[PDB]
RNA sequence: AUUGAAAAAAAUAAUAUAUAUUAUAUAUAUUAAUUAUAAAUUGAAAUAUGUUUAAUUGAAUAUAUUUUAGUAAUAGAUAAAAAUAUGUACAGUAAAAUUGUAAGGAAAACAAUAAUAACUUUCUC
């Protein structure tokens, strides 16, 4: 049987994963529970008495309503220590420049450019390739020599395809899996490797960088079943 | 009584201490308590499911690797030997960074070295 | 001789009544050397910090991507290679 | 006391009697600390841990792939050897201690989907030696630790006595703090990003550093602690500052695996490996 | 939405209180908790923020899970497995949790906590294991009621006794209590609460109160005494209080003789044992059993031998213990028992 | 109970009140507190009563009445640093040696160092 070299290039996510609707709400609740149970902010430590910095902090803050004799407090009598209502959550409001974070969605994402690497930042992108036929697949390469190791050969092939734009890193010498068949007596040993910093851009007609959910749409069903578990969900 | 250094130490100690800084106990109604329990239990179940999914995936990957390596051993001994080496001092590349909360100004570097 | 803070009588935390130390913490945004922002919980009161020297501008963490400085500043008009070639006769040593 | 003879009587049933539950003494203590009704309640899973998420997604699969050795069997550790029964004096004799070591060593298992190496715990041991003179220095060190971590420190006391170093027994000297879960992860992330780049000439954690089994360590000077953002934000509040040891405990079978794992979280490693 | 449906599912799984149910299921945290009865206290109270939407999501998640379980549950044929599936489906239901936790389990009202329902029965079992069962086991071991009467116990049914007819006061007896001779003058009332899946129609039970500590001066030791013996009793998960109402005179193999401890004879353990009958196949209806009433004796009673004879399995137990007081003579006189012996204060 | 928001009730336990019994039970009502305790010409906050600004509320400021700040460690049934050495109840396991780690070095501190077959529960193929 012919030995062939499968390669799937894994661009790892550059930001946090997006939270599930269930997850977000739960986290908010836990944060609010924490706040309710949180201690008083010891302002006396962080801000020295009779100082310009303290004064601004005081102005930003608003104090708690104290207990006073001859008055009904229908939400119980105020329990105060270090200037906080013990019965409730405390809120503490706070080059010289405002830290403005960048948008997590990108220009590429908006346009839906599949060849770009900046198109999904919270997901793991995988390099797919379209051959002479209409099928998509992970980059295949013929291993005729069999002198060098397999992963190294794969990397060299990728580099050749690129024209030395790509900068990859093999995770290991061990192959993740095999794609095998009876019609063509061959064996495609799949290597894993990580794109670190470069273009691809280019026999194969077209390519794309896709998440696990999009690969199912592009690639055949049997092929997907064979190589589903290899891909990360996020 | 005390020096300024002693005072500052006491203040520092206070920052860490629970003395007169902590609120009342979080009391709930019985209905509220139940609601909380149902929230927590469901969450725990979800977390377990996620763990199983990930664990299952890992097991599947391991099985695939095993299947591959047996095949490699059968076909080309040299290739199998090359694959199965001690990767003792293997280091993850310093470019594969831990994904931040929000992305940088330059999202991706196209040139290198 | 030994400098100390002499202890008062300790307050009896009853069994079951012990409460966990939940310190007051703010959600603080750290903008690193480049524009990548990251949220971290912090005890000091500052909603936003921007950092100058981080892993994201250190050469050790990204290989692929002040006496000397003072000297450069105050010998700038002269512009100080050609200068090396001029002042490097290797006969005397 | 009529006697000191301790002797637990056998029972006539297999039901496991939890004696704590039969009392009415500590009603708040019968609840688990996870339960909302306990005064010991704390919101655990407050926000999504970032380093942990990264490990789950990218690293864990990669680590598994690295650690696969084909048909790798278990390597048994050094254990207590039994005596050959070639003499009647071997008959109730305690077993021979292990070959090289006095203590027994664990078995090294092959890495599979279950036992992939991962972060277990961080411990930040700060023993300030000037606090043999000044107890207040121990307090300041503990505060610093708390600031750095967002976790409650525990006081270290002088366990030993020695004349050469002016050290008594039973004297409060610095503090420690075992970080676990999300706080630990945050602390690691801060170390990777903020602090360890601001050390000027740092090559890395040594490759000769570590336990024999999945534990790696290093230490920060008093100069290095001034880069932590809680410290960093105010120079003025901290005139003095104390170094610290940082014991990272992994779920790794061996130390090279642990080193590889830490590298995955952006820890540089410089020295010649064992 | 399986948990809102009550076509096939019992009524007990819902909360019977309307206000409580409304509070549980609302779209905003507007209403105030029915548990807090007082207006001022309600005003004072503040529930934790964001709790509603998350709760709703959790409900949906667990409701979906329950529905999925039910898909399996109906396909299942064998009964224990089906019951287990049913339990799995409904155990995380908030309404059933509310019902169980905050209403009485001992004298359960059928509409609130139905022990015919498998989930509620499972909950009750779990509750029993948490405290009451452990306590019972401790009292059996410490007092030495197990090896002295009947080798071991594997507690399955929760057994609670009462003495309503003697005095007037209502009190479930805590295991290993010292009761007065006035209290235990007339017979007790049992409640055998069964938590295992069992054939309610076929399964009969026997109840034996035994006194291991009556002194035999010929042997210079003690002998057993069957103080009260019932057989062929029918239990039902909800209808389980063994009272003169239920059992007939035919069921009484040995009618209640009261504790009458002798002076200085010591403390006398009275340990009730509850056995279930052996169930015979290929026979519809409850399989009775005949006891040879001349063979079994009350003044000396091999409990273990009796059990061996009739092939019984001890599922439950309870114990009190009586010692001499002034009124035991009066009790004897009432029952027509003889004057009663008096022993030496010293155990020489 | 008055106040906010938009017929009732059905556990345990605690509290209040009542009574049942030579039975520390039952009935009804309600779910408090939970890390505090005197003493502060000086810090900080609230409320009330005035005055000025853009019937009004915000904002500023004066007096009065309060409230906070005395900033101090254990937060765990703690478990081989030191401290109450006799009772009882509940629970746990030491040491050495080895491999490491900022000053630390043979000798300060912290970490790690025997085996999971079977069993129960939970999630899952």
Curated annotation (Swiss-Prot), chain B:
Q: What does this protein do?
A: Component of the mitochondrial ribosome (mitoribosome), a dedicated translation machinery responsible for the synthesis of mitochondrial genome-encoded proteins, including at least some of the essential transmembrane subunits of the mitochondrial respiratory chain. The mitoribosomes are attached to the mitochondrial inner membrane and translation products are cotranslationally integrated into the membrane.
Q: State whether it acts alone or in a complex, and with which partners, per the record.
A: Component of the mitochondrial large ribosomal subunit (mt-LSU). Mature yeast 74S mitochondrial ribosomes consist of a small (37S) and a large (54S) subunit. The 37S small subunit contains a 15S ribosomal RNA (15S mt-rRNA) and 34 different proteins. The 54S large subunit contains a 21S rRNA (21S mt-rRNA) and 46 different proteins.
Tell me one GO biological process term: mitochondrial translation
Q: Which gene encodes it?
A: MRPL28
The protein depicted here goes by the name Large ribosomal subunit protein mL40
* GO molecular function ontology, one term from the record: structural constituent of ribosome
Q: Which GO terms describe its cellular component?
A: mitochondrial inner membrane; mitochondrial large ribosomal subunit; mitochondrion
Keyword set, alphabetical order: Mitochondrion, Ribonucleoprotein, Ribosomal protein, Transit peptide
Task: Name the family.
Answer: Belongs to the mitochondrion-specific ribosomal protein mL40 family.
* Compartments it resides in: Mitochondrion
Q: Other remarks on record?
A: Present with 6300 molecules/cell in log phase SD medium.
UniProtKB/Swiss-Prot annotation, chain C:
Comment text on domains: Contains two functional domains. The central domain is sufficient for general mitochondrial translation but not suppression of COX2 mutants. The C-terminus sequence is sufficient for dosage suppression of COX2 mutants.
- What protein family does this chain belong to? Belongs to the bacterial ribosomal protein bL31 family. Highly divergent.
Q: MF terms per GO, please?
A: structural constituent of ribosome
Region annotated Sufficient for general mitochondrial translation sits at 17-80
Q: What is its main location?
A: mitochondrion
Highest taxon of the lineage: Eukaryota
Going by the UniProt record, its keywords in alphabetical order are: Mitochondrion, Ribonucleoprotein, Ribosomal protein, Transit peptide
The role this protein plays is: Component of the mitochondrial ribosome (mitoribosome), a dedicated translation machinery responsible for the synthesis of mitochondrial genome-encoded proteins, including at least some of the essential transmembrane subunits of the mitochondrial respiratory chain. The mitoribosomes are attached to the mitochondrial inner membrane and translation products are cotranslationally integrated into the membrane. Overexpression of bL31m suppresses mutations in the COX2 leader peptide-encoding and initiation codon regions.
Which organism was this protein described from?
Saccharomyces cerevisiae (strain ATCC 204508 / S288c) (Baker's yeast)
**Is Mitochondrion found in the keyword set?**
yes
Q: What is one Gene Ontology biological process annotated in the Swiss-Prot or TrEMBL record?
A: mitochondrial translation
The GO cellular component terms are: mitochondrial inner membrane; mitochondrial large ribosomal subunit; mitochondrion
Stated name of the protein: Large ribosomal subunit protein bL31m
Instruction: Give compartment(s).
Output: Mitochondrion
Q: Which gene encodes it?
A: MRPL36
Q: Which residues of the full protein are shown?
A: 20 to 134 of 177
Curated annotation (Swiss-Prot), chain D:
Q: Name one GO molecular function term.
A: RNA binding
Going by the entry's taxonomy, the superkingdom of the source organism is recorded as Eukaryota
The answer to whether the entry has keyword Ribosomal protein is yes
* Locations listed in the record: Mitochondrion
Q: Which UniProt keywords apply?
A: Mitochondrion, Ribonucleoprotein, Ribosomal protein, Transit peptide
One of the Pfam families matching this protein, by short name: Ribosomal_L5
Q: Which GO terms describe its cellular component?
A: cytosolic large ribosomal subunit; mitochondrial inner membrane; mitochondrial large ribosomal subunit; mitochondrion
InterPro entries per the record?
Ribosomal_uL5, Ribosomal_uL5_C, Ribosomal_uL5_dom_sf, Ribosomal_uL5_N
Please tell me where this protein is predominantly located: mitochondrion
Q: Which family, according to UniProt?
A: Belongs to the universal ribosomal protein uL5 family.
What does the function comment of this entry state? Component of the mitochondrial ribosome (mitoribosome), a dedicated translation machinery responsible for the synthesis of mitochondrial genome-encoded proteins, including at least some of the essential transmembrane subunits of the mitochondrial respiratory chain. The mitoribosomes are attached to the mitochondrial inner membrane and translation products are cotranslationally integrated into the membrane.
Q: What is its quaternary makeup? A: Component of the mitochondrial large ribosomal subunit (mt-LSU). Mature yeast 74S mitochondrial ribosomes consist of a small (37S) and a large (54S) subunit. The 37S small subunit contains a 15S ribosomal RNA (15S mt-rRNA) and 34 different proteins. The 54S large subunit contains a 21S rRNA (21S mt-rRNA) and 46 different proteins. Unlike bacterial L5, uL5m does not bind zinc.
PANTHER family, alphabetized = 60S RIBOSOMAL PROTEIN L11-RELATED
Protein name, per record: Large ribosomal subunit protein uL5m
Q: Which gene carries the instructions for this protein? A: MRPL7
Curated annotation (Swiss-Prot), chain E:
Q: Which UniProt keywords apply?
A: Mitochondrion, Ribonucleoprotein, Ribosomal protein, Transit peptide
Annotated compartments: Mitochondrion
Q: What is its main location?
A: mitochondrion
Instruction: Please give the GO cellular component terms listed in this UniProt entry.
Output: mitochondrial inner membrane; mitochondrial large ribosomal subunit; mitochondrion
UniProt superkingdom: Eukaryota
- Gene Ontology molecular function, alphabetical: structural constituent of ribosome
The family database entries (InterPro entries) matched by this protein are listed as:
PEBP, PEBP-like_sf, PEBP_euk
Q: Name one GO biological process term.
A: mitochondrial cytochrome c oxidase assembly
The entry sums up its family as follows: Belongs to the phosphatidylethanolamine-binding protein family. Mitochondrion-specific ribosomal protein mL38 subfamily.
| Protein task | Component of the mitochondrial ribosome (mitoribosome), a dedicated translation machinery responsible for the synthesis of mitochondrial genome-encoded proteins, including at least some of the essential transmembrane subunits of the mitochondrial respiratory chain. The mitoribosomes are attached to the mitochondrial inner membrane and translation products are cotranslationally integrated into the membrane.
Q: How does it assemble?
A: Component of the mitochondrial large ribosomal subunit (mt-LSU). Mature yeast 74S mitochondrial ribosomes consist of a small (37S) and a large (54S) subunit. The 37S small subunit contains a 15S ribosomal RNA (15S mt-rRNA) and 34 different proteins. The 54S large subunit contains a 21S rRNA (21S mt-rRNA) and 46 different proteins.
Q: What else is known?
A: Present with 7700 molecules/cell in log phase SD medium.
- What is this protein's record name? Large ribosomal subunit protein mL38
């Amino acid at each position: 049987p012919k030995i062939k070299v499968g390669v799937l290039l894994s661009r790892i996510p550059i930001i946090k994963s997006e939270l599930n609707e269930l997850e977000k709400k739960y986290y908010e609740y836990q944060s609010e529970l924490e706040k309710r149970l949180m201690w008083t902010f010891p302002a006396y430590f962080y801000f020295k008495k009779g100082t310009v910095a303290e004064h601004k902090f005081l102005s930003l803050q608003k104090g708690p309503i104290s207990k006073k004799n001859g008055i009904w407090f229908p939400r119980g009598i105020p329990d105060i220590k270090h200037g906080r209502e013990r019965s409730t959550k405390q809120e503490v409001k706070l080059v010289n420049r405002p830290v403005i974070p960048n948008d997590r969605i990108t220009e590429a994402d908006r346009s839906n450019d599949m060849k770009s690497l900046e198109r999904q930042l919270s997901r793991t992108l995988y390099l797919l390739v379209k051959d002479k036929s209409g099928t998509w697949k992970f980059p295949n390469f013929d291993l005729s020599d069999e002198s060098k190791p397999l992963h190294v050969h794969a990397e060299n092939e990728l580099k050749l395809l690129s024209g030395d734009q790509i900068y990859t890193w093999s995770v290991s010498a061990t192959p993740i899996g095999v794609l095998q068949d009876e019609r063509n007596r061959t064996a495609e040993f799949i290597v894993k490797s990580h794109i670190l910093a470069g273009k691809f851009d280019l026999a194969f007609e077209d390519f794309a960088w896709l998440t696990k959910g999009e690969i199912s749409e592009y690639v055949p069903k049997d092929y997907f079943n064979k190589t589903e578990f290899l891909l990360a969900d996020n | 009584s005390l020096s300024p250094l002693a005072q500052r130490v006491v203040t520092q100690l206070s920052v860490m201490s629970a003395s007169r800084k902590q609120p009342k106990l979080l009391k709930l109604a019985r209905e509220d308590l139940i609601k909380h329990q149902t929230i927590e239990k469901c969450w725990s179940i979800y977390q377990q499911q996620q763990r199983e999914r990930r664990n299952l995936q890992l097991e599947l990957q391991y099985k695939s690797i095993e299947r591959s390596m047996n095949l490699l051993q059968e076909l080309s001994p040299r290739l199998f030997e090359a694959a199965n080496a001690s990767e003792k001092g293997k280091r993850f590349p310093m470019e594969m960074k831990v994904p931040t909360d929000f992305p940088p100004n330059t999202l991706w570097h196209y040139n290198f070295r | 001789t030994r400098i100390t803070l002499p202890r008062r009588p300790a307050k009896k935390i009853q069994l079951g009544k012990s409460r966990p130390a939940i310190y007051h913490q703010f959600n603080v945004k750290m903008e690193l050397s480049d524009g990548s922002v990251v949220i971290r919980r912090s005890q000091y009161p500052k909603g936003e910090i921007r950092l100058i020297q981080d892993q994201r501008n250190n050469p050790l963490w990204n290989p692929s991507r002040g006496s000397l400085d003072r000297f450069n500043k105050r010998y700038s008009s002269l512009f100080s290679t050609v200068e090396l070639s001029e002042e490097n006769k290797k006969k005397t040593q | 006391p009529k006697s000191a003879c301790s002797l637990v009587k056998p029972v006539h049933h297999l039901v496991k009697i939890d004696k704590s539950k039969l009392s009415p003494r500590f009603p708040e203590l019968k609840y688990d600390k996870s339960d909302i009704r306990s005064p010991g309640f704390k919101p655990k899973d407050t926000h999504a841990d970032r380093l942990n998420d990264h490990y789950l997604n990218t690293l864990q699969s990669d680590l598994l792939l690295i650690n696969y050795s084909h048909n790798a069997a278990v390597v048994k550790g050094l254990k207590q050897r039994a005596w050959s029964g070639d003499s009647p004096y071997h008959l109730n004799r305690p077993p021979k201690n292990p070959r090289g070591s006095k203590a027994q060593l664990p078995d090294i298992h092959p890495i599979k989907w279950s036992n992939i190496p991962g972060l277990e715990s961080v411990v930040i041991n700060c023993f300030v030696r000037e606090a043999r003179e000044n107890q207040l220095l121990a307090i300041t060190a503990a505060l610093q630790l708390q600031q750095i971590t967002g976790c409650k420190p525990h006081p270290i006391f002088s366990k030993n006595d020695v004349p050469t170093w002016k050290l008594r027994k039973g004297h409060q000297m610095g503090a420690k703090v075992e970080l676990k879960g999300k706080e630990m992860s945050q602390f690691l992330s801060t170390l990777t990003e903020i602090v360890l780049p601001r050390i000027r000439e740092y090559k890395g954690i040594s490759n000769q550093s570590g336990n024999r089994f999945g534990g790696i360590s290093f230490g920060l000077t008093a100069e290095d602690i001034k880069f932590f953002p809680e410290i960093d934000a105010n120079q003025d509040s901290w005139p003095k500052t104390f170094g610290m040891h940082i014991n990272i405990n992994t779920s790794a079978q061996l130390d090279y695996q642990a080193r590889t794992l830490l590298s995955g979280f952006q820890f540089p490693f410089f020295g010649e490996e064992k | 939405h399986i948990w809102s449906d009550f076509t096939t599912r019992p009524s007990s799984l819902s909360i019977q209180s309307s206000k409580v149910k409304n509070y549980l299921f609302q779209k905003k945290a507007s209403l105030d908790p029915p548990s807090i009865s007082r207006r001022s206290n309600r005003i004072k109270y503040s529930p934790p923020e964001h709790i509603d939407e998350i709760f709703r999501m959790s409900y949906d998640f667990l409701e979906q899970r329950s529905s999925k379980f039910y898909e399996l549950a109906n396909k299942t044929k064998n009964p224990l497995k089906k019951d287990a599936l049913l339990i799995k489906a409904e155990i995380n239901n908030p309404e059933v949790q509310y019902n169980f936790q905050f209403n009485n389990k001992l004298n359960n009202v059928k509409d609130i906590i139905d022990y015919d329902v498998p989930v509620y029965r499972h909950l009750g079992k779990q509750h029993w294991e948490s405290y009451g069962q452990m306590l019972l086991m401790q009292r059996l071991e410490t007092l030495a009621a197990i090896p002295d009467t009947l080798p071991t116990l594997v507690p399955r049914a929760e057994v609670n006794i009462k003495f309503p007819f003697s005095t007037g006061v209502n009190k479930w007896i805590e295991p290993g209590e010292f009761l007065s001779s006035n209290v235990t003058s007339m017979r007790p009332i049992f409640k055998i609460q069964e938590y295992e899946l069992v054939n309610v129609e076929k399964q009969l039970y026997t109840v034996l109160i035994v006194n291991p500590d009556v002194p035999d001066l010929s042997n210079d030791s003690f002998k057993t005494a069957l103080c009260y013996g019932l057989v062929n009793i029918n239990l039902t998960y909800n209808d389980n209080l063994i009272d003169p109402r239920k059992f007939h005179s035919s069921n009484i193999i040995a009618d209640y003789l009261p504790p009458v401890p002798e002076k200085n004879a010591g403390k006398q353990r009275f340990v009730v044992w509850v056995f279930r009958q052996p169930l015979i196949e290929d026979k519809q209806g409850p399989n009775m059993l005949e006891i040879d009433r001349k063979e079994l004796s009350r003044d000396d009673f091999d409990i273990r031998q009796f059990t061996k004879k009739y092939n019984l399995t001890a599922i439950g137990a309870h114990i009190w213990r009586s010692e001499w007081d002034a009124k035991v003579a009066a009790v004897r006189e009432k029952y027509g028992l003889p004057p009663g012996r008096v022993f030496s204060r010293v155990r020489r």
